Each structure stands twice: as C-alpha cells, then as structure tokens.
Design an enzyme around this catalytic site. Structure first.
Site, PDB file in Angstrom:
ATOM      1  N   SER A 193      -0.023   7.050 -23.474  1.00 31.99           N
ATOM      2  CA  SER A 193      -0.407   5.893 -22.677  1.00 31.99           C
ATOM      3  C   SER A 193      -1.778   5.328 -23.021  1.00 31.99           C
ATOM      4  CB  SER A 193      -0.359   6.223 -21.183  1.00 31.99           C
ATOM      5  OG  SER A 193       0.973   6.546 -20.786  1.00 31.99           O
ATOM      6  N   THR A 248      -5.954   7.690 -19.493  1.00 33.12           N
ATOM      7  CA  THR A 248      -5.260   8.942 -19.740  1.00 33.12           C
ATOM      8  C   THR A 248      -4.042   8.748 -20.630  1.00 33.12           C
ATOM      9  OG1 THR A 248      -4.013   8.590 -17.693  1.00 33.12           O
ATOM     10  CG2 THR A 248      -5.908  10.060 -17.574  1.00 33.12           C
TER      11      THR A 248
END
Ligand SMILES: *C(=O)[C@@H]([C@@H]1N=C(C(=O)O)[C@H](S[C@@H]2CN[C@H](CNS(N)(=O)=O)C2)[C@@H]1C)[C@@H](C)O
Length: 233
Positions: free
Chosen positions: A43, A182
C-alpha cells in the site's frame, strides 16, 4: 547530526531502517543488505498512484469522491464512499484500483519509469501490480523517491505534490508533522514517509519481515527515542 542506534527495535523482527535529513548527502542505514533489496511496495504505492492519478487527471483533487459499488469487502470501513484523501488515510484498495484502471497501462508505465520507482515493472496487471506482484522497490529507493517528493523535484506539477503531501499527514504535534504510509502483505511490513521537526526534515523508510502496523510502531519508537516525535505525555 544524529548518532542513530536502533538495534533494540529490531530484536524480534528482521528489518532495515533508512533515514536521511534532507541536507545530508547520504542516508543513514541499519541493515544495508535488506535496505538495498527490492520488495513489493504494497500500500505504500498509494503515494505514487495518487501523484499519477492527479497528474493525468484521472482524479480531480484530494476530495474526489468515488462511490462504493455495494460489494462487501473484508474491511468494513472500505464498504462506503471514499475520496482520494480518505482512500490514502484508510488505505482503501478499491478506490486506488479504480484510479489505476482510469490511469491505464500506458500512462502508468510512463510515470512509474519517469519517477524511477524500483524495477518499474507493472506487468502484474494494471490494478494488481503493487501487491506482492511484479513491482518492487528497495527501502533506499523509497527514501530517494520521498526525498524528491518532499523537495518537490519530481516531474509532477507542484500543486499535485503539495496535495499528496497533505494527504499523507499521519501525526500532528506542536513541533512536528509526521507524513507517511503503511504497507502490508506477504510478510513485508512497510512504513515510509518523512518527519518535519522544526527546521529539520528527515526522510525515512522502515521495512521488516512482519506487518505495516509493526513497521509503523518501530518507526514511532525510533523517532521518539531521538525526540523528533513527542513522547506520550
Ligand atoms: C496495503 O498495504 C494493503 C492494503 N492496505 C490495507 C490496510 O488495512 O491498511 C489492507 S492490509 C490487510 C488488513 N488486514 C489484513 C491482515 N493485517 S496484518 N496481519 O497485515 O496486520 C491485511 C489492504 C490489503 C495491500 C494493498 O498491500
């Protein structure tokens, strides 16, 4: 200059840490072997994806609303309407997949190459290539890319870089703002970003065998140790 020492944060995880004040010539590196290894960005690719979506006009701004398609996905908070900005904060994959499809193979390929994003390989599929797939980037390469985003030297419009940096705000404190993202999947744990603290800015990447939340936690502990982030007072 900061005499970095971070071994105590990696006792139970294999990992690497890369950090560079923007005026420094080279980053400081813990575990150089892993720092030069390329991993699927997971991500963390949302940073580049958002820049490219804005640059190509696939999305209008951080408030560009996309409508939930009614498909029940694994994370409840995904099952509602989202914007480019809420999509980054909540890591809403379906939003960024829809955007990637609109960007399309030819434009995505060009921009990923133009910003030197790791091996630049998106052949895994236009809305799949960043998840444990063909595209891979090293922690050192993430810091190089994010340094250019911070310093606004990437070949994007200034406005789009400022928009994406606003979307990346993670923590607001009296004397600092942490920006970051993250990444998780296939036991690759990322936290990448930069912290502005007074008149210093540090570009960083944490990458572990583990999860994005674990990588983020390690990052906070390091930044706190060195007073770049306030303690939990
Ligand atoms: C991003 O790294 C991934 C996408 N982002 C997600 C997120 O919630 O931030 C999820 S990751 C998903 C959430 N829960 C599962 C298990 N959690 S763990 N053990 O990793 O902490 C995994 C979504 C897939 C992805 C695109 O890389």
């Amino acid at each position: 200059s900061i005499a970095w020492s971070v071994d105590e944060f990696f006792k139970n995880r294999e990992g690497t840490f890369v950090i560079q004040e923007v005026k420094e010539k080279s980053p400081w590196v813990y575990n150089k072997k892993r720092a030069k290894e390329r991993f699927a960005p997971q991500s963390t690719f949302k940073v580049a994806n958002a820049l490219i979506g804005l640059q190509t006009g696939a999305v209008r701004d951080e408030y560009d609303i996309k409508y939930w398609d009614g498909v029940k996905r694994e994370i409840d908070n995904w099952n509602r309407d989202h914007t480019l900005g809420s999509g980054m904060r909540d890591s809403v994959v379906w939003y960024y997949q829809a955007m990637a499809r609109d960007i399309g193979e030819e434009r995505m390929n060009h921009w990923v190459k133009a910003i030197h994003y790791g091996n630049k390989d998106i052949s895994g599929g236009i809305d799949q290539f960043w998840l444990s797939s063909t595209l891979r980037i090293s922690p050192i390469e993430q810091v190089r890319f994010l340094k250019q985003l911070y310093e606004e030297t990437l070949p994007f419009d200034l406005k789009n870089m400022r928009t994406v940096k606003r979307m990346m705000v993670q923590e607001e404190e009296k004397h600092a703002t942490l920006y970051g993202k993250t990444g998780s999947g296939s036991d690759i744990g990322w936290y990448v970003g930069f912290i502005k603290h007074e008149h210093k800015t540090y570009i960083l990447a944490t990458n572990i065998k583990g999860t994005g939340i674990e990588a983020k936690d390690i990052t906070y502990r390091i930044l706190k140790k060195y007073h770049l982030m306030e303690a939990s007072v």
